[PDB]
């Protein structure tokens, strides 16, 4: 696929990135190129409308990085894009998890029965997401699907997600 | 203005966050309005063509809730976005830039190879307070000796004069705020 490689060729990997033996992916060369950008968004649109039709309500983005994809992601789609932020940055009446950090969520971004797609830029472990989704769920909402531009898929965070689907332009292991 | 009254009727005012006596303006109905994200967006874009023509090599993003608009605003703009962080988070030769967020310090970082001498950037947060964030970011896109044209937000907080810290550096808000 040519757009998927235009993604691909502008993901760099750092060795002993934070720690040695474990290879970090640097998505930010993606972001910097306008056409890289736009192929991940444009994959990642398809994807879901292919999956999910109409049935989609709103994107849930997570802090950080998520913020980069959620707002393009929920244009495409014509949605709107609701934020799960770290704990202490939201206003108002929230819920929050930890997983430690803490995830936090205003009380009124969504109804209940509504359903959302959460977007971060990669899946590691999937304790990020896996709180998110909790989160969510706390809300009422229905979690469709989990999505990211990478999954490092020996970390099995696929697994920890499911029975929430998830799916990925990108896979390392 | 139509357009502007979209992002306007969006923003969200919370008194006494964080603390008592200020009112935290809340841009997330934006983000979860499309028509209003989109007028938001269109409205940067507008004002920075109007300025700056074709001279806009990037946009640079201000972690965390600059990350919403940078990349949109790019893509609009058809650049690329390059990005500030908040320190620890960046693989790879990196410079930094510490300064006073509430009663502490944070510090802000970029990538030494995000940006070459002389190219031309507008950076963007989501609102501009006491200017302390968006200073920080001119300060380290200076060290790559890039030049920053201009700062922009959605909001900015007048009395607190964030407007004349950026001075000589220009900047635009599309909503003012006491
Ligand atoms: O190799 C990496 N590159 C970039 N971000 C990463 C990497 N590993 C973890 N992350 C960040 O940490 C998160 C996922 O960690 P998890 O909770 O272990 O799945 C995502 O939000 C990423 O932004
Ligand atoms: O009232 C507010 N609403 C939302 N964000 C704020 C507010 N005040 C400060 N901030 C955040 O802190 C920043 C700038 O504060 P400054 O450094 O004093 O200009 C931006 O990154 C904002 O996201």
Redesign the interface.
């Given at each position: 696929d040519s757009e998927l490689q235009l993604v691909e060729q502008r993901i760099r990997s750092?060795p002993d990135?934070?720690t040695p033996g474990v290879v970090?992916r640097?998505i930010?060369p993606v972001?910097?190129?306008?056409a890289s950008?736009?192929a991940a968004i444009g994959l990642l649109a398809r994807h879901l409308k292919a999956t999910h039709g109409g049935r989609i309500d709103?994107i849930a983005?997570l802090?950080?990085?998520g913020?980069?994809?959620?707002?393009?992601l929920?244009?495409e789609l014509?949605?709107?894009?609701?934020?799960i932020?770290?704990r202490g940055?939201?206003?108002?009446p929230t819920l929050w998890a930890s997983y430690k950090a803490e995830l936090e969520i205003?009380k009124d971004?969504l109804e209940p029965g509504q359903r959302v797609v959460v977007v971060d830029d990669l899946l590691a472990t999937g304790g990020t997401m896996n709180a998110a989704c909790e989160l969510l769920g706390r809300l009422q909402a229905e979690v469709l699907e989990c999505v990211s531009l990478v999954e490092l898929t020996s970390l099995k965070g696929r697994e920890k997600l499911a029975p929430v689907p998830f799916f990925s332009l990108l896979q390392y292991e």
């Open positions: 750092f990135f934070p970090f640097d930010s972001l910097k190129d306008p950008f736009r709103y983005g802090d950080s990085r913020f980069l994809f959620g707002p393009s929920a244009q014509g949605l709107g894009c609701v934020l932020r770290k940055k939201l206003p108002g205003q971004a």
